[PDB]
Write an enzyme that holds these catalytic residues in place. Structure first.
Site, short mmCIF file in Angstrom:
data_model
loop_
_atom_site.label_atom_id
_atom_site.label_comp_id
_atom_site.label_asym_id
_atom_site.label_seq_id
_atom_site.Cartn_x
_atom_site.Cartn_y
_atom_site.Cartn_z
N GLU B 22 0.79 -1.08 -0.09
CA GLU B 22 -0.14 -0.05 0.06
C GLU B 22 1.00 1.16 0.02
O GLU B 22 1.91 1.23 0.52
CB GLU B 22 -0.97 -0.01 1.05
N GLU B 36 2.37 1.48 4.38
CA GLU B 36 2.25 0.09 4.80
C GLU B 36 2.06 -0.96 3.92
O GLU B 36 1.74 -0.85 2.63
CB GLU B 36 1.14 0.05 5.73
N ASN B 38 0.77 -5.30 3.75
CA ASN B 38 0.12 -6.47 4.35
C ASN B 38 0.58 -7.60 3.76
O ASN B 38 0.61 -8.04 2.50
CB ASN B 38 -1.42 -6.28 4.21
N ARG B 40 -0.81 -10.87 3.56
CA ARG B 40 -1.84 -11.39 3.93
C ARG B 40 -2.83 -11.14 2.55
O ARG B 40 -2.75 -9.99 1.82
CB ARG B 40 -2.65 -10.99 5.04
#
Lengths: 84, 84
Positions: B22, B36, B38, B40
């Site tokens: 992101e 950030e 992730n 996942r």
């Protein structure tokens, strides 16, 4: 299968670039046994080229070897290549 | 370019499977800055799927993740994928 055997040997010694594994074969036995390999481009490279296309495009063996020296990674799996 | 930056970060930490980086972006500046990441699968996976085809075939994100767990290597470069 000739491929699976050939890839095992080249990976074991570690290899970069283009090369050729040579076998010896008996029709009566029906099995192939390893004889020798050459770590060098053969003279017969343009011959095998006429029976292989990658992604529907003409293949150039020397081209890739320069691109291999470039450090770029490949673009095709074993699949994209078909004989004609 | 968004890709070149994203691949650098994932390689640096080491990564296997599917993930999402992101960013945060300002139109006036015209540059993107990292916010950030992730590690996942997102909920928005089927959305991005509608705008990407690999080798002219429909893409299934979960499929590859099982195939990634299989240990098989990929079949396509970044190129085979095109938006439509």
């Amino acid at each position: 299968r000739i491929g699976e055997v050939a890839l095992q040997a080249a990976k074991a010694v570690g290899y970069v670039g283009a090369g050729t594994v040579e076998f010896i074969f008996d029709t009566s036995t029906g099995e192939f046994y390893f004889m020798e390999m050459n770590t060098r481009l053969q003279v017969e490279h343009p011959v095998t080229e006429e029976v292989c296309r990658i992604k529907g495009a003409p293949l150039d063996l020397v081209k890739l070897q320069i691109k291999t020296a470039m450090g770029k990674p490949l673009t095709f799996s074993q699949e994209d290549v078909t004989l004609v």
